[PDB]
Amino acid sequence: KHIVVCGHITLESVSNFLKDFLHKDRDDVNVEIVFLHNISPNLELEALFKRHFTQVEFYQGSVLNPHDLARVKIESADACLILANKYCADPDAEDASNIMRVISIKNYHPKIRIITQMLQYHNKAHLLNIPSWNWKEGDDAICLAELKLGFIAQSCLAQGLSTMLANLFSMRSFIKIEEDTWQKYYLEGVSNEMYTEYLSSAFVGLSFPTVCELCFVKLKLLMIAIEYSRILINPGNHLKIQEGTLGFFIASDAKEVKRAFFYCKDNMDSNVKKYDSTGMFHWCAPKEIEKVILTRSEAAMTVLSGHVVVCIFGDVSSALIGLRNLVMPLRASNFHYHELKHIVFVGSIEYLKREWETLHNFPKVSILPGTPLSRADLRAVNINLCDMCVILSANDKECILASLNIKSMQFDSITTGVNIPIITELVNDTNVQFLDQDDDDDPDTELYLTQPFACGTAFAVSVLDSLMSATYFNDNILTLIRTLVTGGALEALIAEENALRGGYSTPQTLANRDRCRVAQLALLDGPFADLGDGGCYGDLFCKALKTYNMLCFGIYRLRDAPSQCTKRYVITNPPYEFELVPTDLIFCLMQFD
Ligand SMILES: [Ca+2]
């Protein structure tokens, strides 16, 4: 029993893959992980892998030559996994080559299961032309851009979200930290993973919320979503559990998840296109780029707050990031218009000009041609008043620099820029060291343990690698992440035209507005103030979905809870009796209105 892992095979990705797969593979005694890449062995730096692991085989060939597919025994492989060169300078060419891989592989034996990565969402669509590619029967494409920027978009609604998600499918061994440090409660959250299990018969006919409560109280399971088909994240009262309903769970061990299966005892306003045809996203007629370009002085004249500043490094030759993947989720029809966060891009207009083709259908987007390094540009766009600052590079030193330059900026009674929401996307793990000064840097302490990561202040693509194995073991985890992260899913129409098309709001489209959204919640003013002082997370949770159909799934705590530092870290799915603090913020899914 074996899987073939081909594509971009690097000591760096091999050892990373093997780490992922063997933490999650319950019975790793059977499986052979068979690697296949054209580059010559590296028999020295490679037989140490044949050493540390007994279930590994390397081969010389390439997936395109049918004889190699034979001498690797693809016909009998459980699945074949294609790894992409995440950092390749011509993504479209890299994506094409893996599609070619798929084709060759399916031509040989059209029933093998293929998991692959794609760089760009527009390339993902082409796999649908391959007659033997079947999403339904478990072929998967992990799209790097849609998920990278989806993670980041959600984090603008709830900081830290990106890293909370990442730890639910990165598979690691608890460190057993005993001191009463922030690291301690953080590592507790990390131990949680995401599982999927059918619901006991005893539940059928009950409402999602009642059942959710039972899982929480009786079973100590966090149930976040439901499927019969399309996934429903945290639906409301009107939604009953029928038979053969699949449940989505966060919990620290697979054993506890099983319990859930074994339970006993006005005229004109109608004429404005405000949405895409499915009523799933806010839409607007294609504004021409000029209507949206700002000058430093214009931007200065307007005050902005609660907005998203997206700093971008790149020029005409840069490969397109595919920014629609960032702005689309932030334009989901389940936000109220007034509520949408304005997005301001700061970067080369020559670059941005290119992205604009796919962005011209989203409201409240504007571009200030400038540089994330210019303090004046950053002052004009009111960086200190913003809701989140996203720092991205196109195909790290620039980003880090931008990041550092904001923190060391002064405002107004004078305020320092150390406390503004930043998320920087990194290409190299090792240099997260530079993101903040008050942390404890070590060059081989894994990314997920560094302060910046725990705090949702850094994101790397490397994190989406462990998603490879996660989706091998459980197809559904991927489709959940995707559903949550991108807003909703419609995958058919974007596949055709590569553009959201606008429509007139019919009541059935307006129904699609009724979905949950990610949000962060304060315990200062809310109807939960009382619970602030030494209350139970469980008591909160309970009142939350009881009174509001609002599911909570974590805390965002100040690491220092005497200090001025407002850095916060993620605590995923705490137990019932976890003690609240009034300065806490809570990760929740809220119902539409
Ligand atoms: Ca540091």
Alpha helices (runs of H) in 37-181, residue ranges in sequence order: 43-46, 49-52, 66-71, 91-108, 121-124, 144-157, 161-169
| Ion ligand 1 nearby residues (CB, 5 A) | 433, 439, 441
CA–CA separation, 21 vs 12, rounded Å? 15
- Rounded distance from Cα 441 to ligand 1 centre (Å): 5
Sequence letter at residue 312: I
Neighbours of 564 (CB within 10 A): 8
Supply the range of the domain harboring residue 466: 1-593
Residue with tokens 């399971």: 221
> Would you state the structure tokens that stand for residue 562, as one six-digit string?
């005497």
- Rounded distance from Cα 450 to ligand 1 centre (Å): 9
- Rounded distance from Cα 154 to ligand 1 centre (Å): 25
**In angstroms, what CA-CA distances link 354 with 316, 476, 483, 498?**
8, 35, 27, 15
Which runs of E-coded beta strand occur in 293-401?
308-313, 343-347, 365-369, 388-393
Sequence letter at residue 134: N
Contact between 331 and 342 (Cβ < 8 Å): no
Q: Half-sphere exposure of residue 557, counting CA atoms within 13 Å on the CB side?
A: 23
Write out the H or E segment, with its range, that includes residue 467. helix 466-473
Contact between 131 and 153 (Cβ < 8 Å): no
- Rounded distance from Cα 350 to ligand 1 centre (Å): 34
Contact between 79 and 115 (Cβ < 8 Å): yes
CA–CA separation, 22 vs 269, rounded Å? 57
Burial of residue 103 (CB within 10 Å: 0-12, 13-18, 19+) is middle
- Rounded distance from Cα 451 to ligand 1 centre (Å): 8
Contact between 425 and 345 (Cβ < 8 Å): no
- Rounded distance from Cα 365 to ligand 1 centre (Å): 33
Supply the DSSP symbol for 293.
B
- Rounded distance from Cα 90 to ligand 1 centre (Å): 32
Can you tell me whether residue 180 is helix, strand or coil? coil
Q: How was this structure determined?
A: X-ray
> Would you state the structure tokens that stand for residue 187, as one six-digit string?
């590592």
> Would you state the structure tokens that stand for residue 210, as one six-digit string?
């009642």
Residue with tokens 């959204």: 517
Can you tell me whether residue 265 is helix, strand or coil? coil
- Rounded distance from Cα 17 to ligand 1 centre (Å): 27
Reported structure resolution in angstroms: 3.0
- Rounded distance from Cα 438 to ligand 1 centre (Å): 6
CA–CA separation, 533 vs 558, rounded Å? 15
- Rounded distance from Cα 579 to ligand 1 centre (Å): 30
- Rounded distance from Cα 254 to ligand 1 centre (Å): 36
Q: Which of 485, 484, 472 is nearest to 138 (CA)?
A: 472
Supply the DSSP symbol for 320.
P
Count of structural domains, the chain: 1
The residues with which 396 forms a beta bridge, in sequence order, are: none
Contact between 388 and 156 (Cβ < 8 Å): yes
- Rounded distance from Cα 448 to ligand 1 centre (Å): 14
Contact between 197 and 249 (Cβ < 8 Å): yes
CA–CA separation, 206 vs 486, rounded Å? 29
CA–CA separation, 225 vs 589, rounded Å? 11
- Rounded distance from Cα 436 to ligand 1 centre (Å): 4
Contact between 450 and 183 (Cβ < 8 Å): no
- Rounded distance from Cα 348 to ligand 1 centre (Å): 29
Q: Which of 415, 452, 458 is nearest to 437 (CA)?
A: 452
- Rounded distance from Cα 452 to ligand 1 centre (Å): 9
- Rounded distance from Cα 181 to ligand 1 centre (Å): 18
Contact between 478 and 502 (Cβ < 8 Å): no
